[PDB]
Write an enzyme that holds these catalytic residues in place. Sequence first.
Site, short mmCIF file in Angstrom:
data_model
loop_
_atom_site.label_atom_id
_atom_site.label_comp_id
_atom_site.label_asym_id
_atom_site.label_seq_id
_atom_site.Cartn_x
_atom_site.Cartn_y
_atom_site.Cartn_z
N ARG B 116 0.80 -1.23 0.00
CA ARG B 116 0.00 0.00 0.00
C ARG B 116 0.83 1.27 0.00
O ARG B 116 0.24 2.36 -0.03
CB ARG B 116 -0.92 0.03 1.21
CG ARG B 116 -2.04 -0.97 1.14
CD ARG B 116 -2.84 -0.83 2.37
NE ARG B 116 -2.17 -1.51 3.46
CZ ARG B 116 -2.56 -1.46 4.73
NH1 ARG B 116 -3.61 -0.74 5.05
NH2 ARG B 116 -1.88 -2.13 5.66
N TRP B 285 1.77 -4.85 -9.50
CA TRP B 285 2.85 -5.75 -9.88
C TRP B 285 3.01 -6.81 -8.79
O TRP B 285 2.51 -6.64 -7.68
CB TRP B 285 4.17 -4.99 -10.09
CG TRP B 285 4.49 -4.04 -8.98
CD1 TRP B 285 5.13 -4.33 -7.80
CD2 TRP B 285 4.20 -2.64 -8.94
NE1 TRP B 285 5.24 -3.19 -7.03
CE2 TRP B 285 4.68 -2.14 -7.71
CE3 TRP B 285 3.57 -1.76 -9.83
CZ2 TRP B 285 4.55 -0.80 -7.34
CZ3 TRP B 285 3.44 -0.43 -9.47
CH2 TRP B 285 3.93 0.04 -8.23
N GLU B 290 4.35 -14.38 -4.03
CA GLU B 290 3.02 -14.75 -4.51
C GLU B 290 3.09 -15.81 -5.59
O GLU B 290 2.17 -16.62 -5.71
CB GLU B 290 2.29 -13.52 -5.06
CG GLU B 290 2.15 -12.32 -4.11
CD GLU B 290 1.23 -11.22 -4.68
OE1 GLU B 290 0.00 -11.45 -4.80
OE2 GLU B 290 1.74 -10.12 -5.01
#
Lengths: 415, 415
Positions: B116, B285, B290
Amino acid sequence: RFLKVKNWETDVVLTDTLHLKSTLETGCTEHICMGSIMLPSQHTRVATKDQLFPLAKEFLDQYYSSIKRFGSKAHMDRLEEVNKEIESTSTYQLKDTELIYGAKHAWRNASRCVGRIQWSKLQVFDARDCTTAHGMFNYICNHVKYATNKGNLRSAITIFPQRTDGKHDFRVWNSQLIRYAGYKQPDGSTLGDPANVQFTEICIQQGWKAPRGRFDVLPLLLQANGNDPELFQIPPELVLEVPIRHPKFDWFKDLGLKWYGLPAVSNMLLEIGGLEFSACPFSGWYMGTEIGVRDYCDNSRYNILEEVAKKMDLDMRKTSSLWKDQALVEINIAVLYSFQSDKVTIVDHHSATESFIKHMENEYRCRGGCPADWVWIVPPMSGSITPVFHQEMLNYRLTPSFEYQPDPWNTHVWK
Amino acid sequence: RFLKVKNWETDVVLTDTLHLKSTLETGCTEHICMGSIMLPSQHTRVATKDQLFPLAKEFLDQYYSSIKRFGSKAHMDRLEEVNKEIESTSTYQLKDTELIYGAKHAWRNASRCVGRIQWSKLQVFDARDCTTAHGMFNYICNHVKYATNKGNLRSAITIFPQRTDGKHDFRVWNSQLIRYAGYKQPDGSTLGDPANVQFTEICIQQGWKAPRGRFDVLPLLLQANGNDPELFQIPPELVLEVPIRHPKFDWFKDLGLKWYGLPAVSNMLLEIGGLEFSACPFSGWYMGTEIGVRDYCDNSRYNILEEVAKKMDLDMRKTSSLWKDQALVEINIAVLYSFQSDKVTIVDHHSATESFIKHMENEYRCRGGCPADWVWIVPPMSGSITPVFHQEMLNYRLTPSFEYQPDPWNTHVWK
Ligand code: HEM
Ligand code: HEM
Ligand SMILES: Cc1cc(N)nc(COc2cc(CCN3CCC[C@H](F)C3)cc(F)c2F)c1
Ligand SMILES: Cc1cc(N)nc(COc2cc(CCN3CCC[C@H](F)C3)cc(F)c2F)c1
Ligand SMILES: C[C@H](O)[C@H](O)[C@H]1CNc2nc(N)[nH]c(=O)c2N1
Ligand SMILES: C[C@H](O)[C@H](O)[C@H]1CNc2nc(N)[nH]c(=O)c2N1
Ligand SMILES: [Zn+2]
């Protein structure tokens, strides 16, 4: 009111009614979650007589419920018996049987503990007849010897007499019975174990003569019945240590590291039926990550990823070469290997997390739930490749329990 | 009432008043913590007119508070203006300026989001003039092209018209705009991506002709104004993919893996001033973990630790050889490397967690706090060597926000 926790690796679902018996608060409210605060004001630990009978009542009602005598004359008489003693002395004393029960269930209810599958296999040493710091040193030594059992480790707890007035208090001042000393240097950097540099100082304050090296086993600081604590050194023959080698890199010996076999947490408070045991050191065996990941590689602990990566010849320029990750898996293969080649009990983080799931199964089946703190159950490396990463856990606080407590030198009204 | 979060790596302390503006509930109560339940009934998403003006009021009061016109005539007029439109049509419409604000703050308030720090640098595409599934395909394609920006990725969101009655509803039925297909085999095992095998079926149900392989880019399923969804295939030239090699092992090419550059979450619900945008795909991105950790190595995802460990020649008998850990660090060095050698934006899990702390600093300084979900912020490998492992985070739910919502094929009153 009868909540459901899911696993998302196995699509397995358990039902948790056990949280209905819960009692203590958790820090969380309807509008905020403290699940990652380290020591909430809830987890930290002075009780009066009116407060005491409910807690004695509730605990005895589960202790007799667990021996298939819920409510009989044995139950009722013991209820009146402690109610009576609670009138007489405002407080009361636990049966030998109630101590082993309460003790084992403080472990069983410890939501931050990944190894609770072993909670019933626990050895309880009753040190409530203790009176001096010397008596404490003798009980603690017999504990070290027993739990160590030649590296075939065994779980144990030693229970010094309960807090009474509140100023006559038995405390072990060490965080763990066995810990390496921590020494600041001229340049400010830290030899030994940065975590304990405060304690090492109070030890030398009270008179320790430090062999100012790295892996110096600290002495015991034992406070008895409120008196000022006294220094005792465990016999070195009882401090089993494991030299850390690697099954490849012959320079891993030259790294020169070692760790103690026995993790023995001493600084916390055992709560049973409303009674507070301020000294109650308990031990088990290590999960490999506790040493290889946290002890050796926490930035503010031993901080060896610097040196290990060097010897491996590692792309330490870029952050994204993942050289820290690389040297951490090697460091943890070596701790495990070293411990196992010496027949000292250790558990890898995969084995232990799998058992905790198998454990969670039985706690939900034969007990209706299992309090569990995900933040603390997930091992601190390779999180999502272990099965607890994907298991939802309801946290809640039952009793009997283990509670944090303030360090003595802050509270102790000295001399 | 003015809570304190601590970091235990840096002994740094922040104060959180921002949680006082919080509104939604969290699942946690005083006596239980749900901090590890995946999708609480709180995080999942039908609103009436009486309910709507407070939410419109509260949102406009912060939007004007943030342009240094808290309470002026511009504020008051707009308050009466939407109050009026809320009388007339029971609902209302957001200014272009209010959409960019609300959008950016749903990201800023997304407590499970480690990235964030970039929330203000967000590109808002207003697709509220859209009417057909074809219109949606065209907006979504222009989004893919823009955010991809030749691998120099850019953050973007496209906001299809808000839910009105509730049955006239725009939905992207794909979880992410770009995802590989998932095919069950004869022996039950799964080619492609096990996660999406359900969706792949509904795609072929509605008429997809699958190239039954691994990394088959799925087609888009687009539902417009409540109508039955329709299949569209993104032009392959707009689907940027990264072949995964390693900077050592030449057999890593023969492993044969690849991933799409753009993570674009499409299946969730953007809430702004009480209005519900059921379709609102957003992209950024990737963080390396992940893909390398979760996608490639989750047991019920691509599950390649089997095959990678083989080629490395690994002690796969014992659990405690830590061969899974070994092959996971290698797998993640390769994803990062491959992405960076192609000038496709990717962030390693150390860089990203450090920024989130630097971010947390500014949110507490210039905003009074920062909602953060530790369970989800900590990367799923090498947890404690990243700095967020040691940062206490208060979780709480502000608004504007992103909310989960049920999958359409369960709810959609078909044909
Ligand atoms: C049998 C082998 C055991 C293993 C492998 C084990 C492992 C662990 C680990 C990894 C933690 C997380 C703490 C950290 O990593 O900093 C923990 C916490 C804890 N364990 Fe166990 N442990 C064992 C035995 C015991 C025993 C014998 C007791 C008590 C009788 C106990 C009670 C606790 C408590 C109270 C906590 C901390 C809860 C808190 O901080 O609030 N454990 N253990
Ligand atoms: C800029 C680069 C970004 C990175 C590196 C990033 C990274 C992440 C990661 C690692 C997660 C955890 C989810 C998982 O791992 O399964 C997450 C969640 C999330 N992100 Fe970010 N993200 C980025 C951009 C964005 C954008 C552009 C938005 C919205 C405009 C957004 C909103 C969210 C939301 C809503 C969640 C999930 C919250 C929940 O599940 O309740 N993120 N992100
Ligand atoms: C018997 C046993 C076996 C085993 N294998 N492991 C353990 C770990 O039991 C712990 C550990 C801690 C550490 C908290 N951390 C420590 C660094 C300082 C930081 F401030 C706090 C606290 C407790 F309350 C515990 F009970 C115990
Ligand atoms: C823009 C962007 C960039 C980036 N780099 N990463 C992300 C990840 O955003 C997510 C991810 C998820 C995954 C939840 N998981 C997924 C596997 C299935 C499991 F069931 C749930 C849910 C969300 F709601 C999100 F917002 C987004
Ligand atoms: C910030 C957070 O509260 C703190 O780092 C916790 C996270 N989880 C943990 N888990 C274990 N096992 N041990 C720890 O010391 C911690 N520390
Ligand atoms: C059980 C738990 O709720 C679940 O595994 C969560 C844990 N934390 C996570 N964190 C991220 N970033 N992504 C996830 O999918 C999850 N899954
Ligand atoms: Zn909570």
